[PDB]
Write a protein that binds this ligand. Structure first.
Ligand code: NAG
Ligand code: NAG
Ligand code: NAG
Ligand code: NAG
Ligand code: NAG
Ligand code: CL
Ligand code: CL
Ligand code: NA
Length: 656
């Protein structure tokens, strides 16, 4: 029962992030003091060292720019960001060490290509806590490359922008590597947290949980304290892929609701395709993007979110639409921009006869833009105690399958259907024996047979499917597991492509109705009536012509005669018939395929003892075919053994 696994070199060097190379299958783990490159089965190939190093967070600029007067401590370098830059066959890794500098590593050997560190913005943030920074690389065909990066700033609002866009030139040795995409006094590709907002509210900060590119936009999902107990707000922040001025900035709350509970604290997210049921539920094409998200109940307890948590789905289209409607109503002069932490105050929308296209990327007016009314997601599934902590999803055979990690190291497999049910958990695996919470980063092997999952101490490769755990066609085809069918002749629950000869008639059942059944006649015989010929019919069967054998429980196995779906077998002989405990005795009559060697169907077969009854009424009312011999004064299965034909009694009505 043991999956492939990789452990941290040390109990304090916890794992942070994880990514799999879509083309190579190479596995990259971002950890404290280490960046690891691993094989598919999690065999380490390269261990790139990133720490520890003597440092102090008070040291700004960093030690690599300036000598520091502060006392230094050997400091752990937390992986804050880990992203594959596919176009350029390299990996971007940014730690917490030295105010959050970054490295570019070559994919094959993790040899350092460059480490930008002369410019102020080359330092992303001194924050040493995971789950607070996220990046997205965007490189079209005619562009050298771009990096969007959002991060908590820890109150150092003048040191670090909370969101920005940087140059990711193709050439590693470019002097402009990681420079602001645009940098001027009052127009830059960056957002800074106003000093007045930290003054008003501390410890005000903005946490970037997830980010993604979809269509012509980038999206960041954030949590931050609300501004005039502490209440937090989870938001969708959108920008156009092509907008140095950051004029396209817009920000809406989001979350979801079910059964009298509001889930507003964002925990995790993952962009995927809908699957057929959600596509219909959402009225979108099956290859449009859907955001799968985990939220905890309420808007409080950010550092220790309630156990009560939910898996929700947001179609990107529904998001863009609610954003467009917001833009439109603002450019009609309705209401305010409503983004107090940034604008600092109430700013009124400006009416202007500008057409708001699907791909409107902002102007000078009416930006940045907030809003109060939340984007509501579709709640798929909820839990009450084993708090959900991560999420990944993909589509198998038109079914959206969602994997959800829990705080106790469990992995749930949810099958997504639209309303009215939403989602159905069809399995839960125990992944980490130590009960360690599952971290946010999960990723599939290149052909989606496995899902890589991590705790702070461990990376584990978990099979997407374990169909063989279902041992009857009934269990298999009612599990609700999209991967699982019944391999008829091998008596096995498996993937179609794992079932030999699946393409041949009735070899593979995809539906409970396609499960074989077995009819026997007669379905019961007198114990004294041995060596009977029985007629077995196999419903919904495949070719049996290779050969069939009949097994009478443990007692017997004889070669059957096969004609289509009909089998004829000889019942056990005198020595082999079972003895009855004092009226009958049941057992499973089974067919073994000679082609495969496996028992694949069964049904009950009963032996009875008419002699067991010693009174006419008892004999006659037997569940089995018994006859009372009036004169011989006994019960029998064979009426021709009564003394006279006149002695035969079959019904109780004429019992003496
Ligand atoms: C699996 O494990 C062995 C251990 O050395 C390794 O050689 C092999 O490359 C691994 N297979 C993969 C995932 O490529
Ligand atoms: C983050 O900073 C705090 C400051 O007190 C420190 O205690 C903690 O160990 C740090 N986490 C790291 C460097 O792993
Ligand atoms: C999606 O849903 C709406 C409402 O049912 C429908 O009018 C529309 O035609 C559907 N798809 C298209 C073509 O936009
Ligand atoms: C067959 O079944 C009987 C009980 O029904 C058992 O006592 C016997 O050991 C079994 N024979 C085997 C397993 O070969
Ligand atoms: C039928 O029942 C009688 C007892 O009523 C018993 O003596 C006889 O052995 C039974 N036949 C069996 C169990 O084979
Ligand atoms: Cl808290
Ligand atoms: Cl179900
Ligand atoms: Na069939």
């Amino acid at each position: 029962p043991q999956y492939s696994t990789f452990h941290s070199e040390n109990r304090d060097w916890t794992f942070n992030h994880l990514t799999v190379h879509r083309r190579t299958g190479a596995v990259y783990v971002g950890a404290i003091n280490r960046v690891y490159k691993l094989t598919g089965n999690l065999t380490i190939q390269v261990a790139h060292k990133t720490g520890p190093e003597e440092d102090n967070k008070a040291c700004y600029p960093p030690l690599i720019v300036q000598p520091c007067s502060e006392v230094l401590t050997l400091t752990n370098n937390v992986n804050k960001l880990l992203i594959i830059d596919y176009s350029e066959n390299r990996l971007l890794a940014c730690g917490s060490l030295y105010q959050g500098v970054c490295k570019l590593l070559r994919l094959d050997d993790l040899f350092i290509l460059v480490e930008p560190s002369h410019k102020k913005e080359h330092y992303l943030s001194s924050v040493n806590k995971t789950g607070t920074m996220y990046g997205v690389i965007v490189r079209s065909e005619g562009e050298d490359g771009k990096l969007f990066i959002g991060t908590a700033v820890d109150g150092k609002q003048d040191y670090f922008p909370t969101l920005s866009s940087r140059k990711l030139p193709r050439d590693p040795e470019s002097s402009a590597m990681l420079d602001y995409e645009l940098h001027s006094d009052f127009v830059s590709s960056l957002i800074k947290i106003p000093s007045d907002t930290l003054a008003l509210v501390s410890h005000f900060d903005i946490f970037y949980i997830y980010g993604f590119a979809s269509g012509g936009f980038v999206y960041f999902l954030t949590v931050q304290p609300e501004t005039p107990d502490l209440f937090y707000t989870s938001r969708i922040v959108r920008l156009c892929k092509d907008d140095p001025k950051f004029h396209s900035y817009v920000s809406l709350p989001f979350g979801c609701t079910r059964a009298g509970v509001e889930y507003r604290l964002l925990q995790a997210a993952y962009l995927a395709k809908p699957g057929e049921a959600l596509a219909q539920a959402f009225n979108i094409s099956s290859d449009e993007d859907v955001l799968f998200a985990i939220f905890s109940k309420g808007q409080k307890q950010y550092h220790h979110p309630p156990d009560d948590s939910a898996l929700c789905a947001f179609p990107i289209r529904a998001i863009n639409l609610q954003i467009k409607e917001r833009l439109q109503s603002c450019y009609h002069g309705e209401g305010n921009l409503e983004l107090n932490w940034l604008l600092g105050k109430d700013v009124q929308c400006t009416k202007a006869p500008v057409p708001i296209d699907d791909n409107f990327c902002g102007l000078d007016i009416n930006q940045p833009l907030g809003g109060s009314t939340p984007v509501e997601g579709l709640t798929l599934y909820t839990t009450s105690r084993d708090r959900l902590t991560s999420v990944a999803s993909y589509v198998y055979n038109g079914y959206s399958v969602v994997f959800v990690g829990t705080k106790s190291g469990k992995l749930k497999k949810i099958r997504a259907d639209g309303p009215p049910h939403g989602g159905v958990q069809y399995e839960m695996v125990s992944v980490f024996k130590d009960g360690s919470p599952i971290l946010r980063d999960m990723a599939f092997s290149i052909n989606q047979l496995y899902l890589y999952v991590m705790s702070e101490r461990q990376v584990t490769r978990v099979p997407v499917e374990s169909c063989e755990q279902y041992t009857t066609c009934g269990e298999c085809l009612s599990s609700g597991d999209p991967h699982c069918g019944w391999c008829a002749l091998h008596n096995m629950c498996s993937r179609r492509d794992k079932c030999q000869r699946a393409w041949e008639a009735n070899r593979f059942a995809a539906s409970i109705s396609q499960c074989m059944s077995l009819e026997v006649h007669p379905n019961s015989i007198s114990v004294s009536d041995h060596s009977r010929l029985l007629s077995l019919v196999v419903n919904d069967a495949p070719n049996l012509s290779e050969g069939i054998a009949c097994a009478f429980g443990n007692l017997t196995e004889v070669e059957g005669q096969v004609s289509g779906s009909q089998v004829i077998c000889i019942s056990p002989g005198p020595k082999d018939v079972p003895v009855i405990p004092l009226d009958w005795f049941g057992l499973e009559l089974q067919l073994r395929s000679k082609e495969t060697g496996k028992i694949f169907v069964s049904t009950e077969f009963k032996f009875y003892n008419c002699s067991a009854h010693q009174l006419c009424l008892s004999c006659v009312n037997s569940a089995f075919r018994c006859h009372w011999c009036k004169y011989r004064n006994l019960c029998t299965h064979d009426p021709t053994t009564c003394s006279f034909q006149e002695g035969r009694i079959n019904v109780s009505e004429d019992c003496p």
